[PDB]
Protein backbone atom coordinates (compact mmCIF):
# COMPACT_ATOMS: atom_id res chain seq x y z
CA UNK A 1 0.00 0.00 0.00
CA UNK A 2 2.76 2.46 0.92
CA UNK A 3 4.60 1.36 -2.22
CA UNK A 4 1.70 2.35 -4.45
CA UNK A 5 1.34 5.55 -2.42
CA UNK A 6 4.80 6.65 -3.52
CA UNK A 7 4.61 5.38 -7.11
CA UNK A 8 1.15 6.82 -7.69
CA UNK A 9 2.50 10.01 -6.17
CA UNK A 10 5.31 10.29 -8.71
CA UNK A 11 2.66 9.72 -11.36
CA UNK A 12 0.28 12.50 -10.32
CA UNK A 13 3.23 14.88 -10.05
CA UNK A 14 4.31 14.30 -13.66
CA UNK A 15 0.66 14.72 -14.60
CA UNK A 16 0.93 18.18 -13.05
CA UNK A 17 3.97 18.98 -15.13
CA UNK A 18 1.50 18.56 -17.98
CA UNK A 19 -1.63 19.82 -16.09
CA UNK A 20 -4.23 17.12 -16.82
CA UNK A 21 -6.91 16.74 -14.10
CA UNK A 22 -5.87 14.28 -11.38
CA UNK A 23 -9.14 12.78 -10.16
CA UNK A 24 -9.64 11.08 -13.57
CA UNK A 25 -6.02 9.96 -14.02
CA UNK A 26 -5.90 8.42 -10.54
CA UNK A 27 -9.29 6.80 -11.11
CA UNK A 28 -8.12 5.31 -14.43
CA UNK A 29 -4.78 4.05 -13.14
CA UNK A 30 -6.27 2.58 -9.99
CA UNK A 31 -9.45 0.96 -11.37
CA UNK A 32 -7.46 -0.70 -14.15
CA UNK A 33 -5.10 -1.78 -11.38
CA UNK A 34 -7.94 -3.53 -9.55
CA UNK A 35 -9.20 -5.21 -12.74
CA UNK A 36 -5.71 -6.51 -13.49
CA UNK A 37 -5.44 -7.85 -9.96
CA UNK A 38 -8.76 -9.68 -10.25
CA UNK A 39 -7.70 -11.15 -13.59
CA UNK A 40 -4.50 -12.31 -11.90
CA UNK A 41 -6.52 -13.93 -9.12
CA UNK A 42 -8.64 -15.75 -11.72
CA UNK A 43 -5.49 -16.95 -13.47
CA UNK A 44 -4.05 -18.42 -10.30
CA UNK A 45 -7.43 -19.99 -9.60
CA UNK A 46 -7.35 -21.66 -13.00
CA UNK A 47 -3.76 -22.86 -12.72
CA UNK A 48 -4.50 -24.21 -9.25
CA UNK A 49 -7.47 -25.94 -10.89
CA UNK A 50 -5.26 -27.28 -13.67
CA UNK A 51 -3.22 -29.02 -10.97
CA UNK A 52 -5.68 -29.99 -8.17
CA UNK A 53 -8.57 -31.44 -10.20
CA UNK A 54 -9.29 -30.94 -13.92
CA UNK A 55 -5.77 -32.29 -14.46
CA UNK A 56 -6.35 -33.99 -17.77
CA UNK A 57 -8.78 -31.36 -18.99
CA UNK A 58 -7.52 -27.83 -18.28
CA UNK A 59 -4.74 -25.85 -19.95
CA UNK A 60 -4.01 -22.28 -18.89
CA UNK A 61 -2.42 -19.37 -20.75
CA UNK A 62 -1.46 -16.14 -19.00
CA UNK A 63 -0.09 -13.41 -21.27
CA UNK A 64 1.91 -10.24 -20.67
CA UNK A 65 2.22 -7.20 -22.98
CA UNK A 66 -1.56 -6.46 -22.78
CA UNK A 67 -2.01 -8.93 -19.94
CA UNK A 68 -4.78 -11.35 -20.83
CA UNK A 69 -5.76 -14.88 -19.87
CA UNK A 70 -7.22 -17.63 -22.01
CA UNK A 71 -8.30 -21.05 -20.75
CA UNK A 72 -8.40 -24.24 -22.81
CA UNK A 73 -11.13 -26.64 -21.64
CA UNK A 74 -11.94 -30.05 -23.11
CA UNK A 75 -8.59 -30.29 -24.93
CA UNK A 76 -10.03 -33.23 -26.89
CA UNK A 77 -11.84 -32.19 -30.07
CA UNK A 78 -15.35 -33.61 -30.51
CA UNK A 79 -16.79 -35.19 -33.67
CA UNK A 80 -11.92 -25.49 -31.76
CA UNK A 81 -12.90 -23.61 -28.62
CA UNK A 82 -11.53 -21.63 -25.66
CA UNK A 83 -12.56 -18.81 -23.39
CA UNK A 84 -10.84 -15.43 -23.39
CA UNK A 85 -10.53 -13.07 -20.43
CA UNK A 86 -10.07 -9.48 -21.42
CA UNK A 87 -9.84 -5.86 -20.27
CA UNK A 88 -11.32 -3.36 -22.69
CA UNK A 89 -12.74 0.15 -22.86
CA UNK A 90 -16.50 0.52 -22.86
CA UNK A 91 -17.39 3.54 -25.04
CA UNK A 92 -19.36 6.26 -23.27
CA UNK A 93 -23.08 6.37 -23.94
CA UNK A 94 -24.06 9.37 -26.03
CA UNK A 95 -26.76 9.82 -23.37
CA UNK A 96 -24.28 9.23 -20.54
CA UNK A 97 -22.08 11.96 -22.01
CA UNK A 98 -24.92 14.50 -22.14
CA UNK A 99 -26.05 13.80 -18.57
CA UNK A 100 -22.48 13.95 -17.23
CA UNK A 101 -21.55 17.38 -15.93
CA UNK A 102 -18.96 18.89 -13.57
CA UNK A 103 -18.61 16.62 -10.54
CA UNK A 104 -20.29 13.67 -12.22
CA UNK A 105 -17.95 13.51 -15.21
CA UNK A 106 -17.94 11.07 -18.11
CA UNK A 107 -14.59 12.51 -19.21
CA UNK A 108 -12.70 9.90 -17.17
CA UNK A 109 -11.24 7.16 -19.34
CA UNK A 110 -13.07 4.07 -18.08
CA UNK A 111 -13.27 0.39 -18.94
CA UNK A 112 -14.58 -2.93 -17.71
CA UNK A 113 -13.32 -6.49 -17.43
CA UNK A 114 -15.14 -8.99 -19.60
CA UNK A 115 -15.07 -12.46 -21.17
CA UNK A 116 -16.04 -13.94 -24.50
CA UNK A 117 -15.93 -17.71 -24.97
CA UNK A 118 -14.66 -18.87 -28.34
CA UNK A 119 -16.55 -21.58 -30.17
CA UNK A 120 -15.67 -23.24 -33.45
CA UNK A 121 -16.48 -20.38 -35.80
CA UNK A 122 -18.28 -18.08 -33.34
CA UNK A 123 -17.63 -15.71 -30.40
CA UNK A 124 -20.06 -14.82 -27.61
CA UNK A 125 -19.80 -12.15 -24.91
CA UNK A 126 -20.59 -13.64 -21.50
CA UNK A 127 -21.69 -11.44 -18.57
CA UNK A 128 -19.25 -11.64 -15.68
CA UNK A 129 -20.58 -11.59 -12.13
CA UNK A 130 -18.28 -9.57 -9.90
CA UNK A 131 -18.36 -12.49 -7.43
CA UNK A 132 -17.42 -15.28 -9.85
CA UNK A 133 -15.07 -18.05 -8.80
CA UNK A 134 -12.99 -19.15 -11.79
CA UNK A 135 -14.23 -22.71 -11.27
CA UNK A 136 -17.80 -21.39 -11.21
CA UNK A 137 -17.26 -19.60 -14.53
CA UNK A 138 -15.67 -22.66 -16.14
CA UNK A 139 -18.69 -24.68 -15.04
CA UNK A 140 -21.14 -22.09 -16.41
CA UNK A 141 -19.57 -21.99 -19.86
CA UNK A 142 -18.99 -25.75 -20.07
CA UNK A 143 -22.68 -26.31 -19.36
CA UNK A 144 -23.69 -23.85 -22.06
CA UNK A 145 -21.46 -25.54 -24.64
CA UNK A 146 -22.75 -28.86 -23.33
CA UNK A 147 -26.39 -28.00 -24.01
CA UNK A 148 -25.34 -26.88 -27.48
CA UNK A 149 -23.59 -30.08 -28.59
CA UNK A 150 -26.18 -32.31 -26.97
CA UNK A 151 -29.01 -30.51 -28.80
CA UNK A 152 -26.99 -30.97 -32.00
CA UNK A 153 -26.96 -34.74 -31.54
CA UNK A 154 -30.63 -34.77 -30.58
CA UNK A 155 -31.32 -33.20 -33.95
CA UNK A 156 -29.14 -35.84 -35.62
CA UNK A 157 -31.21 -38.63 -33.95
CA UNK A 158 -33.64 -40.90 -35.73
CA UNK A 159 -36.91 -39.09 -36.55
CA UNK A 160 -39.34 -41.47 -34.93
CA UNK A 161 -37.70 -41.60 -31.53
CA UNK A 162 -39.33 -39.13 -29.17
CA UNK A 163 -36.51 -37.17 -27.56
CA UNK A 164 -36.78 -34.35 -25.06
CA UNK A 165 -34.28 -31.66 -24.06
CA UNK A 166 -34.52 -30.54 -20.43
CA UNK A 167 -32.75 -30.79 -17.05
CA UNK A 168 -29.49 -29.79 -18.69
CA UNK A 169 -29.65 -32.97 -20.72
CA UNK A 170 -31.29 -35.20 -23.28
CA UNK A 171 -34.17 -37.60 -22.56
CA UNK A 172 -34.56 -40.43 -25.09
CA UNK A 173 -37.88 -42.14 -24.47
CA UNK A 174 -38.03 -45.94 -24.73
CA UNK A 175 -41.37 -47.47 -23.73
CA UNK A 176 -42.20 -45.04 -20.90
CA UNK A 177 -38.58 -45.34 -19.74
CA UNK A 178 -35.84 -42.85 -20.49
CA UNK A 179 -32.19 -42.81 -21.42
CA UNK A 180 -30.66 -39.61 -20.05
CA UNK A 181 -27.72 -38.05 -21.92
CA UNK A 182 -25.63 -35.35 -20.27
CA UNK A 183 -22.01 -34.20 -20.36
CA UNK A 184 -19.56 -34.00 -17.49
CA UNK A 185 -18.16 -30.48 -17.39
CA UNK A 186 -14.55 -31.52 -16.79
CA UNK A 187 -14.26 -34.58 -19.02
CA UNK A 188 -16.66 -33.10 -21.56
CA UNK A 189 -17.86 -36.66 -22.24
CA UNK A 190 -21.28 -38.16 -22.78
CA UNK A 191 -22.93 -39.74 -19.73
CA UNK A 192 -25.81 -42.15 -20.36
CA UNK A 193 -27.92 -43.01 -17.32
CA UNK A 194 -31.17 -44.98 -17.08
CA UNK A 195 -34.53 -43.63 -15.89
CA UNK A 196 -35.48 -46.91 -14.25
CA UNK A 197 -32.51 -47.95 -12.09
CA UNK A 198 -30.55 -44.68 -11.95
CA UNK A 199 -27.96 -46.19 -9.63
CA UNK A 200 -26.94 -49.13 -11.86
CA UNK A 201 -27.11 -48.44 -15.60
CA UNK A 202 -27.66 -51.46 -17.86
CA UNK A 203 -24.67 -52.99 -19.58
CA UNK A 204 -25.62 -51.62 -22.98
CA UNK A 205 -25.66 -48.03 -21.74
CA UNK A 206 -22.21 -48.44 -20.21
CA UNK A 207 -20.95 -49.96 -23.44
CA UNK A 208 -22.53 -47.14 -25.43
CA UNK A 209 -20.94 -44.45 -23.27
CA UNK A 210 -17.59 -46.17 -23.78
CA UNK A 211 -18.14 -46.17 -27.55
CA UNK A 212 -19.05 -42.47 -27.64
CA UNK A 213 -15.89 -41.73 -25.66
CA UNK A 214 -13.88 -43.46 -28.37
CA UNK A 215 -14.83 -40.59 -30.75
CA UNK A 216 -14.78 -42.89 -33.80
CA UNK A 217 -18.16 -41.69 -35.12
CA UNK A 218 -20.89 -39.17 -34.25
CA UNK A 219 -22.73 -39.70 -30.96
CA UNK A 220 -26.07 -39.67 -32.73
CA UNK A 221 -25.29 -42.79 -34.79
CA UNK A 222 -24.44 -44.75 -31.65
CA UNK A 223 -27.44 -43.48 -29.69
CA UNK A 224 -29.67 -44.47 -32.61
CA UNK A 225 -28.34 -48.02 -32.54
CA UNK A 226 -28.74 -48.10 -28.77
CA UNK A 227 -32.37 -46.99 -29.11
CA UNK A 228 -33.24 -49.82 -31.46
CA UNK A 229 -31.33 -52.34 -29.36
CA UNK A 230 -32.99 -51.13 -26.16
CA UNK A 231 -36.43 -51.56 -27.75
CA UNK A 232 -35.69 -55.04 -29.05
CA UNK A 233 -34.32 -56.43 -25.82
CA UNK A 234 -37.15 -55.10 -23.66
CA UNK A 235 -39.73 -56.73 -25.93
CA UNK A 236 -37.79 -59.99 -26.30
CA UNK A 237 -37.79 -60.39 -22.52
Amino acid sequence: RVFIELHLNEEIAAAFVLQKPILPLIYNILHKFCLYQRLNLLSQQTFQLSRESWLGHLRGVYDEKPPRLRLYYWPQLNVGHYIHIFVNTQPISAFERTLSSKRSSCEYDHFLLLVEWHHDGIVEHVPLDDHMDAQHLLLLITQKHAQLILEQIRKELHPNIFSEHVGGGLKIHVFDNEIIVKVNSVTGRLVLSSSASPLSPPRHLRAAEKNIALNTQPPAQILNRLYFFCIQTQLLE
Binding site: F3, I4, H7, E11, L25, N28, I29, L30, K32, F33, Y36, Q37, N40, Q44, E64, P66, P67, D109
Partner: peptide, 21 residues
Protein backbone atom coordinates in the same frame (compact mmCIF):
# COMPACT_ATOMS: atom_id res chain seq x y z
CA UNK B 1 5.69 -12.95 -2.53
CA UNK B 2 5.21 -13.76 -6.24
CA UNK B 3 1.55 -12.90 -5.75
CA UNK B 4 2.65 -9.48 -4.52
CA UNK B 5 5.02 -9.44 -7.49
CA UNK B 6 1.88 -9.93 -9.58
CA UNK B 7 0.24 -7.02 -7.75
CA UNK B 8 3.19 -4.92 -8.92
CA UNK B 9 2.90 -6.27 -12.48
CA UNK B 10 -0.75 -5.21 -12.36
CA UNK B 11 0.28 -1.73 -11.29
CA UNK B 12 3.11 -1.26 -13.79
CA UNK B 13 0.78 -2.48 -16.54
CA UNK B 14 -1.93 -0.09 -15.38
CA UNK B 15 0.71 2.66 -15.48
CA UNK B 16 1.99 1.75 -18.94
CA UNK B 17 -1.64 1.84 -20.06
CA UNK B 18 -2.20 5.32 -18.61
CA UNK B 19 1.10 6.53 -20.10
CA UNK B 20 0.29 5.31 -23.61
CA UNK B 21 -3.12 7.02 -23.35
Amino acid sequence: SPEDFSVVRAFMQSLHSSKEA
